[PDB]
Design a protein around this ligand. Structure first.
Ligand SMILES: [Mg+2]
Ligand SMILES: [Mg+2]
Ligand SMILES: [Mg+2]
Ligand SMILES: [Mg+2]
Ligand SMILES: [Mg+2]
Lengths: 93, 113, 64, 274, 348, 93
RNA sequence: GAAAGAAUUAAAUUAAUAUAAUGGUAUAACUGUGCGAUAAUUGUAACACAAACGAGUGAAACAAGUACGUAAGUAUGGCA
RNA sequence: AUUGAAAAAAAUAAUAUAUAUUAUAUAUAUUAAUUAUAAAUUGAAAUAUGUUUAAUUGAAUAUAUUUUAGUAAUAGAUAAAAAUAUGUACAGUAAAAUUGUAAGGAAAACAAUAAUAACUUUCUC
């Protein structure tokens, strides 16, 4: 809500193939237009963002897929295994 | 007026600057404000409790160590001496890494050296 | 001559006037002081004309 | 002005008058910056800090265990010595300065559950010396710093004047940024994992590096900064790049303790220790 | 769930507004805030996301804490400790916070902010310390009303004065104000708000308005003047406005004589002091005290000596200050005081 | 001689009205050399990165555990260890 | 037992003071910051210091107006 | 006030309106704004009106009407880099030397370098 506008003009150069994709991914804010009632106040826009609200910015070549935090050992409840709890401190008894 | 380098510098400056990039102020209703206060205060209390728990635990550990070392001194002087050495250049092992967000492909290495 | 003398004439048209010194190319010196004829604080302004070191008017409106 | 004589009058009550509160001038400023009603509000505790959590869980107990010396008493530092009153000229005399040093040194306490060493602050001093010619280089350096940290940099200016190095006084030259809390922790984690392994012949931080009291430092070349993921992702946008000094400030009594702490966070140490 | 219970706990800890309470405690962020009165403004407004579930969790946490505190509070016997426990239990209650913050503390309605309740009293004290007390202290020190009359003050009660009977207008006097002779022609009204735990039934109070700056030409200095003197006044945390209604003619040790500053005599400080009585043990009911009415004089009045005699402790103070104007002669005439002196403009 | 950007009149931030610089930051997933993913907040717009050279594949951080490419490509039929042993007489130096 | 605050003690006037040198200055007279840009204003100035005269210096107070300050108050150019 | 969502009210402060008093008070209503300001044959966005695709909404594209982009530093009552040298209000403390750190070296920048007894608040055994 309090975050700044994303300065897209810096990270994406004007008239470039990379910028175009980013633009397509994004959706713009509703501008103020004369002779119309905006019952959620008049749009306050600068660098293409509604100042009155939170901004959302949607974004080898491979998707980064993280591994499951629960394990096979955990599922089986194998007490002798070391991979059975990954978020806790295990002690040898 | 300005060179391309000058332009790029200006752009860079803008990235850092608060000029026409920041939203409206976060205004709240009085009820909302109260709710926020209660959220924050409770959280702070919880954090304090956690700190005390950890601090208490540390104190307990210290006491246990003290108890041990006195006993060692009483019984076996050589063992006590061995225990109480300067550990000036003691280095944590490079395998004890800072726990990541998600685990690796190979969770644990059974062979070494 | 580095510092010249000038005559500041009261804006409330009493005829009262106060004299002060300034640097040769200093900005136009207007000051609010007591005019005893009128019995109040009024603006004083330079009666004579003179050249000034022309400063560039700093632009708050972001140009170009 | 009738006089310059400064002389605060005594009072007849023990109530502490906060003068700021009695005014009606700065109503937004009466609120604390932590308070939501202040324009200075920022969400502090946004997510769980990982390095800090690790320190809390594993390291802190280990560090305490390491630093236990049995019946260790306080080691007083070098202080200002008083005069022996063996002459009437000692009577309102200022004390003799410390033995070796001109400035006084702090007392070294035994490590207990309260005063275990931990990370206090990181400072990233980048003074670009080509910016004596080009002011724009300072700006670029500041941006780079901001990118690296996610924290607002502060501009460094030339405090001194010197002819040999073509350096004026009062000229903007690079930037600095004091990281604290979670951002600092993140920056350390990035340094440990991403950047320092990509440095080719990197042995580690020197064991001869540091303050006398709980402060360790090192520096990165312009070659090393291109490994930061924010800089690396747009090498077209970053043609020039500037080195930096990295002052790590710990809550350690002595420097070996600080080194040990940093090692706990996966910082390698190579040289012969003092 | 201790904070929903009102069997043993007072009614004041709840919010009296129903809509506000409903808004506070809902299962989703569906409703709109009662504070925003206007429809369009409500429509415009958007509260921060996820606030409800977290708030509920925080409430549960602090409610549990309060309940735990209460477990100790009832076992406790000594009164100050019990009060402190009660405060600890309820201070983090959202409802009591709402009540205190957003409704008047000066003229508190009993159902909303009850100063009989310990938590609310503590809150009021804290509020006083934050601003009003500091201001009062500053005005006492700067104007030199402390050492000139009465050595020190340890502010305990918040004292506010008013002059309702003279003019007609309603205004609580800010400490160190310049009031006209018309304004201060008839007597003032005090409100002594007490924040410490005190025996309401037994504890009596005295109120003395003193004028240190009336000129004595024999001494070539000034003398004090007791302009208004009340004794043996009964206060209650909520019922605390000292008015001709409350105090009787027996309580008036020196009935109100108005500020009538002389021309060129200067600005005259009128610093009201509020003392609490000495409390005697093994005696049920309010312990009165007799004042020797021939002994104490109004034209010259050792305040410190008086305090020493009757064993008083100054808990509160307030101050205004009057100087000569056209209507002081009229005031004198009304009261039947003499014409009034006129001094030289120069302090030679 | 000295290259500069000449300053405009500074904008007066009033006391109390100063707001903290909350820069626009994305939650970015870093997959390290091995499959261990870690989330970090970052100013550059990229939801996922995978790293090649990290601490998790550097020998210093774990002691216990395209010219070259071109060369490999165009000397592939020969298959270039045995080759080292053949061409390494250590008499002459 | 811990965290935070209020701070206190010690040291310092060796830096800094538009400018010489001396005295003073952290209770800051030094430094930062808001407002301001007014008091680098108008008539009477006693009384002192200094003092051959001519001059010089500090200045209470009275009156008119102004600026800052919640107030107390401070400002009749500059630490001298 | 109309619109969205699913009898009222009880602070401070600000704003609007009214009146009380040789008292810058009170009453009722409401909680705005908060880092902006002219000038862009070229970038980006919205809405409206058309046409084509799978009465419909998405998607594509044309015109019109707007909105944004002039990208520029202080974000802190800033505190010994440089800059407004006289007023006032609020607040703070310098320097040297030492130990270090990428180019950096005697000499550029940044960090660190006296003591917590008692007191208040908070959490806790
Ligand atoms: Mg000077
Ligand atoms: Mg000197
Ligand atoms: Mg003489
Ligand atoms: Mg003479
Ligand atoms: Mg001065």
């Amino acid at each position: 809500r309090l975050m700044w506008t994303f300065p897209a003009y810096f990270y994406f150069k004007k008239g470039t193939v990379a910028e175009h994709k980013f633009l397509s991914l994004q959706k713009g804010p509703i501008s103020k237009k004369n002779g119309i009632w905006f019952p959620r106040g008049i749009p306050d826009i600068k660098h293409g963002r509604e100042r009155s609200t939170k901004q959302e910015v949607k974004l080898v070549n491979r998707p980064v897929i993280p591994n499951d935090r629960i394990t096979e050992a955990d599922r089986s409840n194998d007490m002798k295994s070391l991979e059975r709890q990954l978020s806790r401190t295990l002690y040898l008894l | 007026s300005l060179s391309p380098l000058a332009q790029r510098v200006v752009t860079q400056l803008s990235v850092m600057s608060a000029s026409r990039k920041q939203p409206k102020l976060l205004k709240l209703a009085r009820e909302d404000l109260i709710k926020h206060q209660t959220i924050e205060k409770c959280w702070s209390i919880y954090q304090q409790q956690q700190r005390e728990r950890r601090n208490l635990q540390l104190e307990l550990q210290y006491k246990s160590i003290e108890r041990s070392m006195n006993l060692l001194q009483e019984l076996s002087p050589r063992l006590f001496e061995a225990a109480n050495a300067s550990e000036k250049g003691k280095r944590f092992p490079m395998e004890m890494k800072v726990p990541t967000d998600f685990p690796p492909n190979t969770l644990w290495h059974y062979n070494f050296r | 001559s580095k510092n010249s003398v000038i005559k500041l004439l009261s804006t409330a048209a009493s005829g009262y006037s106060r004299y002060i010194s300034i640097k040769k190319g200093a900005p136009l010196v207007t000051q609010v002081r007591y005019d005893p004829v009128v019995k109040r604080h009024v603006l004083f302004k330079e009666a004579k004309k003179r050249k000034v070191a022309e400063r560039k008017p700093l632009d708050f409106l972001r140009t170009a | 002005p009738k006089s310059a004589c400064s002389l605060v009058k005594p009072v007849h009550h023990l109530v502490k008058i906060d003068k700021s509160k009695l005014s009606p001038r700065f109503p937004e400023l009466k609120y604390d910056k932590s308070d939501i009603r202040s324009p200075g509000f920022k969400p502090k505790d946004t997510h769980a800090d990982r390095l800090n959590d690790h320190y809390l869980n594993t390291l802190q107990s280990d560090l305490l265990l390491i630093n236990y010396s049995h019946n260790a008493a306080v080691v007083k530092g070098l202080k200002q010595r008083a005069w022996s009153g063996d002459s009437p000229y000692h009577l309102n005399r200022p004390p003799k300065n410390p033995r070796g040093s001109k400035a006084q040194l702090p007392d070294i306490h035994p490590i207990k559950w309260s005063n275990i060493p931990g990370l206090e602050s990181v400072v990233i001093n980048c003074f670009v010396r080509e910016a004596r010619e080009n002011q724009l280089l300072a700006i670029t350096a500041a941006l780079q710093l901001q990118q690296i940290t996610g924290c607002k940099p502060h501009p460094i200016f030339s405090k001194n004047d010197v002819p040999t190095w073509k350096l004026r006084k009062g000229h903007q030259m690079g930037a600095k940024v004091e990281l604290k809390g979670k951002e600092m922790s993140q920056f350390l984690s990035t340094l440990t994992e991403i950047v320092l392994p990509r440095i080719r012949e990197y042995k580690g931080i020197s064991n001869q590096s540091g303050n006398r009291f709980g402060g360790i430092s090192f520096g990165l070349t312009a070659e090393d900064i291109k490994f930061f993921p924010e800089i690396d992702a747009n090498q077209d946008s970053w043609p020039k790049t500037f080195g930096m000094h990295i002052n790590i400030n710990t809550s350690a009594q002595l420097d070996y303790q600080a080194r040990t702490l940093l090692s706990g966070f996966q910082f390698p140490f190579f040289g012969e220790e003092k | 769930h201790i904070w929903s219970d009102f069997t043993t706990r007072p009614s004041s800890l709840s919010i009296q507004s129903s809509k506000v309470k409903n808004y506070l405690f809902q299962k989703k962020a569906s409703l709109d805030p009662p504070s925003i009165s206007r429809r369009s403004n409500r429509i415009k407004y958007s509260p921060p996301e996820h606030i409800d579930e977290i708030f509920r969790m925080s409430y549960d946490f602090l409610e549990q804490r309060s309940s735990k505190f209460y477990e100790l509070a009832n076992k406790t016997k000594n009164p100050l400790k019990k009060d402190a426990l009660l405060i600890k239990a309820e201070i983090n209650n959202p409802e009591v916070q709402y009540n205190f913050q957003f409704n008047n503390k000066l003229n508190n309605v009993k159902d909303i902010i009850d100063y009989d309740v310990p938590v609310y009293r503590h809150l009021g004290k804290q509020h006083w310390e934050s601003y009003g007390q500091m201001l009062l202290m500053q005005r006492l020190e700067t104007l030199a009303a402390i050492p000139d009359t009465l050595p020190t003050l340890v502010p305990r009660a918040e004292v506010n004065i008013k002059f309702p009977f003279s003019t007609g207008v309603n205004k609580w006097i800010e400490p160190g104000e310049f009031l006209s002779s018309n304004v201060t022609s008839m007597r003032p009204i005090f409100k002594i708000q007490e924040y410490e735990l005190v025996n309401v039934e037994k504890q009596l109070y005295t109120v003395l308005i003193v004028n240190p700056d009336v000129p004595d030409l024999s001494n070539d200095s000034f003398k004090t003047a007791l302009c208004y003197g009340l004794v043996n006044i009964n206060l209650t945390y909520n019922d605390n406005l000292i008015d001709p209604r409350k105090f009787h003619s027996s309580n008036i040790i020196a009935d109100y004589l108005p500020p009538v500053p002389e021309k060129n005599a200067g600005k005259q400080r009128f610093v009201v002091w509020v003392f609490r009585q000495p409390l005697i043990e093994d005696k049920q009911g309010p312990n009165m005290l007799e004042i020797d009415r021939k002994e104490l004089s109004r034209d010259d009045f050792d305040i410190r000596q008086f305090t020493k005699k009757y064993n008083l402790t100054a808990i509160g103070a307030h101050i205004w200050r009057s100087e000569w104007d056209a209507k002081v002669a009229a005031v004198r005439e009304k009261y039947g005081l003499p014409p009034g002196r006129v001094f030289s403009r120069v302090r030679r | 001689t000295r290259i500069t950007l000449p300053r405009r009149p500074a904008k007066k931030i009033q006391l109390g009205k100063s707001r903290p610089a909350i820069y626009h930051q994305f939650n970015v997933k870093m997959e390290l050399s091995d499959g261990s993913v870690v989330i970090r907040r970052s100013q550059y717009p990229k939801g996922e990165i995978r790293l090649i050279q990290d601490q998790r594949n550097n020998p210093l951080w774990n002691p216990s555990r395209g010219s070259l490419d071109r060369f490999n490509k165009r000397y592939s039929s020969l298959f270039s260890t045995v080759e080292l042993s053949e061409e390494n007489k250590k008499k002459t130096q």
